[PDB]
Symmetry: D2
Subunit: 451 residues, 4 copies
Amino acid sequence: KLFGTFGVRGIANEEITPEFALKIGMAFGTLLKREGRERPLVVVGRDTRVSGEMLKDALISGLLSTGCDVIDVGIAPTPAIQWATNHFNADGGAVITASHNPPEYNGIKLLEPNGMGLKKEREAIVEELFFSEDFHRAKWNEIGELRKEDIIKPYIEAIKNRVDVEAIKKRRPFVVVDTSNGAGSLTLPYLLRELGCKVVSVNAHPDGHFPARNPEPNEENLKGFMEIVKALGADFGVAQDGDADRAVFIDENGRFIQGDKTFALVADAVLRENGGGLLVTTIATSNLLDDIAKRNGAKVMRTKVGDLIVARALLENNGTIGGEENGGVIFPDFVLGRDGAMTTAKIVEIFAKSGKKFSELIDELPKYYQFKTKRHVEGDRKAIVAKVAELAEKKGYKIDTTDGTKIIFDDGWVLVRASGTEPIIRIFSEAKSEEKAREYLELGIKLLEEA
Amino acid sequence: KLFGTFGVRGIANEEITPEFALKIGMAFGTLLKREGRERPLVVVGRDTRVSGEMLKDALISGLLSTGCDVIDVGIAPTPAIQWATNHFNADGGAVITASHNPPEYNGIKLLEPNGMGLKKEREAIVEELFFSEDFHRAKWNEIGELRKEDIIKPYIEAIKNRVDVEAIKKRRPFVVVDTSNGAGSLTLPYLLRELGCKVVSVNAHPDGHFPARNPEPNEENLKGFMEIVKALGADFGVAQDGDADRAVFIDENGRFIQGDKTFALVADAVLRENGGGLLVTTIATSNLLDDIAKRNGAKVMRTKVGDLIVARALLENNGTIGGEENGGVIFPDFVLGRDGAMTTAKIVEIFAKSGKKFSELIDELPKYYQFKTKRHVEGDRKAIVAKVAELAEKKGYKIDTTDGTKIIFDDGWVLVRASGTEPIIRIFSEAKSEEKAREYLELGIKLLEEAL
Amino acid sequence: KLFGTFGVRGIANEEITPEFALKIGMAFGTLLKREGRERPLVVVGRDTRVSGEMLKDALISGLLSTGCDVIDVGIAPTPAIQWATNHFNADGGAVITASHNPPEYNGIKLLEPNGMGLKKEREAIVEELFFSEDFHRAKWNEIGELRKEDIIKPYIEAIKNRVDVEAIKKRRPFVVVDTSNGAGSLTLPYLLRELGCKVVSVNAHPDGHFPARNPEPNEENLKGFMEIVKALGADFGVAQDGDADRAVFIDENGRFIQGDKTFALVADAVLRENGGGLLVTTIATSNLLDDIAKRNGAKVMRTKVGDLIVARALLENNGTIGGEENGGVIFPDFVLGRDGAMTTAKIVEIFAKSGKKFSELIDELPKYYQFKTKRHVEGDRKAIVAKVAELAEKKGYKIDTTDGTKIIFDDGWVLVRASGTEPIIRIFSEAKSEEKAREYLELGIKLLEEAL
Amino acid sequence: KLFGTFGVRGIANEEITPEFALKIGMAFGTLLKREGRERPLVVVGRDTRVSGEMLKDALISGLLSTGCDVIDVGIAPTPAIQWATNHFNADGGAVITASHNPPEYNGIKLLEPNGMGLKKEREAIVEELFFSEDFHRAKWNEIGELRKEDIIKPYIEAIKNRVDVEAIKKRRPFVVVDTSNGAGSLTLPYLLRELGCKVVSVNAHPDGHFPARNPEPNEENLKGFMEIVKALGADFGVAQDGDADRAVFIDENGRFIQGDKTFALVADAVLRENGGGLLVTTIATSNLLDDIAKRNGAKVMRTKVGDLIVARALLENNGTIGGEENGGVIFPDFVLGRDGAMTTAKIVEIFAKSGKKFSELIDELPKYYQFKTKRHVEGDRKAIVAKVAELAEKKGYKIDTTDGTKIIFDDGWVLVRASGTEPIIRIFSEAKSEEKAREYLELGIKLLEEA
């Protein structure tokens, strides 16, 4: 009702008002106080968005009224705030951000004591407190205290200690950074410089108006950035979103690298350095990740679509590496969430150690072809998905029903999953050949039209 | 309904909740935006109270949502925040404080562009916006910006440039300052040190829990401070409240000096250095201030009870000096509000230039005797006061009805005024002699009982 | 001896040691105190260089020991620090920067109360105090206080109030910014966004290691930036140095625009808006500036080579616009020094109002051809320049000897000037045609060889 | 030569110039770098003295030039800066303070990685580097970074966790605090309030001009403060010096309590709660501390006069409690140095748990009478002290020569020791009776005149 997949989000000063942020902070503080903790500690941060400071002030005022001490870490990436929540041994965390949404949007993400996003069980309690307003109001002497900490340099140093800095310094990669005027404008260029790379940063000045483009790093938005990467003659380019929790890589030829391929590279390196392990992923990801685990003697766990679900599965099952179809890699031993800067550091280390070119590393992975479409259908799309699953079952097709209808074929698969946010039923198909991937794609639409 | 005489007050986290502060900030920003200004600038400060930071955060978040730029001056005295509001050319000001109230209380005071407390018409507009919640919500690109400034040192320098520092340094008074862990713990001891005094400070560490006593500097609360002043052998002692907008002085003998006498000293010095002027005050203020103006060739304007009314009359009539019966002196040229530190600096300058002792300076003023009493009467207190006025009129008594019933005599007066906050009708009496002061007090009680 | 053309510079921690910065601060404070001021106020800033904070700390410690109050403005452009020195009514200013030098360099620039670089008369006293160490050591109670201020937003707002923001917002230019990880990474992209432009900034994160390139924005260094400007399809691109006192512009086609042409555009706009005035320049600049002033009914004053000389001439003669051959434009009404951000804002306003393309605006100026060469000559280069002047005088050539030997021809000139630092004698030639410009260049080389 | 017993002090801007502080910082950084550490971390703090900011700036600039990272903790007590040096795992520490010296003085104290004052072996190297100026100058890219931390609240919380807060809250003592406008104006009044006391603070506003009095809390300086304690009717009053490393206590009757008696109370409580231990002290300390250890089954180690020697002996021999004749108590497990705030907290806890009055607690200790006199004698006073020792040896008197000449009697002792700072030979005498204290005192003067 209130929170989406990860946090609540909306238009700033229209839906996410200071009253809304204050009530969210009061509900979170009430949840923390009604759990045994007598003086809960909360780490609060925000991205560069212009409405963040007002929303952060309202949230902190709400948290202090409940008797919770608040650590204000200022502007920092969402993975950095998640890391600081565990670093400070806080009882919770809050991020004022809207991820990749346009500048007019903002939102709040509530975190666990370990930095992972808030559990749905606790999110239900937060929603109940928000709508009932049964807030805990601390006495005048029990009102929490606010102190400010800087977490950018400690977080960069924490990332720097998890990679082979000497190899990067020996190679000295030439990396172009596109932080998109987001929270990554304070971490990624400096982290890459300390790794030992030659850094040319694009839109690396923190600006909540996002003068260049929307903070979503997709191919259409990164058309110009790919041209910059081509022109500068760089080894590769990396682009981040507003909260710097995602990293998108561009090769030396200005080609948009899909997130699944960079996730495959990172997972291959991590599993090889771990001698196997567990690879937690979603059901919408490529079979390229399955082959990576097979070549490394590791098991693959396919969860539902969602970064929070992947992080929960990694924590519960002691996973080694995690990621989603968008290519947001999760390093459980570092941060229980997507970390664009850690992914970039790992990719840089892989590039330095390999001795090959970035496009050579990407192309050396097993080849898969994917096609996507989104039929706009209104109504109970879950029933339609179930009916498509039944129709595929009658035709003898092997199917999986974890999140949607995934028809498990021999050389590939076709996935029929309906997004809950909007009345659209997306169809995902993939195979080892161009024709077969489209062949499975038409079958997905064929069954959908039957239902 | 919402605001009192000067700002709204209540128990922190019970009545003055973060929602309340946020709504107050949104209403104030809406008032500022609806008055033509496109990017209003607001100076926001608070006292040392523990609940201040949460309330200040809520208020600032509310102000930024309306499109107003906010200057956060941190912890500072209320007169310092008013001076900063005038100094930064801000379109308004806000103080998170409860003045002298116990530690569990907090409140918000809204200020004018010149630092004076908000006008009653604009306060009514703010109340209407608060209760209707018809707030102006700025777009994402029009959200206000917040910046932090330090005003303690500029405020001290501004006070320091208004007195004869050389005379104070020559005299080097020994002053004991009790800031009561309030916002004055950051200004008054340092200001006194820079004036050239030997400073021994009591409770000068800023603590919002007020471990020593309640921040109200009355004689009962200052019993220990008077003992400290006597023991240390100091020239005089000065005590301030939580927001440091009031100053209470103790002589070298440990005697609680009434605020009217210190106001009389300050007004005498100011009028003498001004060659006369206008002395705006209340109707409860002693005749000691009238004689001060007579000796200085100055006129006296007696307004209703309240420091905001005195400041308004000083601004409108271009007054020279202002004050109330409580002794809160207002310096119109410096700040359009009560300023404890400016009053302390002026008193220190007077003491240094006089060459006498503090008790000698206080006793050289004309002697008046005052008595106070209160009756907890529940009813139409305004009608009772009017009936007392009519009864006094029937008996031939000269009466003034500016605020309550004030019977004027040749040597003194008796005032029958009903408090507007609690069901109590207070009787104020004064005369040039001990016996006559009680005689007027008994007459006031006698007339009150006749009306009752 | 110690100071060069504008400030002292050297390798950090080898020549510009913390001892050197401390001695410089003590000498500057001694100069300020020995000039009558009882508590001088100094505005101290630095660029993004990694050695700046240690040098700034040493300089401030030296300044405080002399009894001078210090305002620390943090990392800011040199023009911003000059603007803050004038804005805070400071008695002096200091900038910890090496301008465009490689990352291993640093230095100190001392400023006047109005923000202009320190006069040579006062620089001689500073050098004498530095070498004699006859510093004024304030007493324990007279040691200056340190204060921190943020000047980025006030400086940006000051630049905004000097251009037609509405026209820029209507046009919405697409500008690519190269701040080169310098002090301009905090001002120029934000200023351009507030003007109303679409801003894509490269190397806009402040980093003192300069990972991309050396902070000098020349064509060889800006080869990649030109490709970025071409690829992005932007209206034009602007590049700044480490201290953000210079601005280099690239047109929509990725062509390196010479600083003289952008200075000509800015001067044309300023003189047209001013209805004439005085154009202060150096003798090494193009005749393009003479035609610009002639078309605007303005006078041209040609000073010696050096930005400090141009600023001094602008201040003394009440000039309207100033600049040098490198294209660093000086706006006397705003800042008495080169300002990259003000120049960028003026250029953006010109582009928005013109309605044409940047290359069209550049090409509409009168066309001149310039050729440059240098000869590494070891000897009395001043005597050789004088001998070249005499040889040209014997041949009937009109010559000006303001700074070097400038042979004033009909359609152009050839300049023979010897660099003070390097043992080289540069030859500058200009004319209205390619062949004739080279013809004048050969004559300059011919005369130099004859003297040699 | 340069450093005294603990640090170097002098008149600010005359002897302790910014050049002197810069050279000290450079020498300390050179010592840290020449000891194998690649990026040493230094915690730098100062007291409220007006000359401390420029001196701190010069010292930090010197430290950064050597390649050492600096944590600037601002204004804090010297024990707080030592605690932060140990807390941040710093490789060293520096305090800009002159302790109890008049306002015109300032100085620098260098600290060990554990917060204890710098060893004499390392102080010699620092002196050699200072005078030879053979400083290590880091490259442009190796220059250290500076960051600021607030240590007041963490230090107060650390002190709170070491005492029984509940007993103090139950008792609610009424304590008068005299911080003398020093660095203790930021910690002690707040610490005592969080303990649960009613706090009336005197001169608790931090001012480097010291408008009230010199920051030395002696009886002549505290004459007015004793009157304040009497007038307010408080349980007891505690006074601190400028750096807040010493605490002087005044009972409810306004009587100046000697530091030895408060040290005896604290040591008794600590040893009782420890079941015995080692009581490290000086040879000038009263026998009152010996009886305290005897009653608690603890041993006494008597070192030479000086707080640094006491701290060194506490660290090397794993001592339990330490202190000197002045009464500066050292808690080895908390801070390897004098801590006025920890001593005040322990005294408050003892007072709360005792149920008696402060004068009753002080008077319950065994009674000793002490007399102090000095003779201004020039020349080699060490030879004179040795000759007095020989004369006492000839007369059959038992003598100890750990520091000066201490004649060990049965009910008391007389000590003949000359301070090296000034040409004065002090005579310390003590006995269990008033008459014998003077009787031993005259014997000390008698033997001194014989030499």
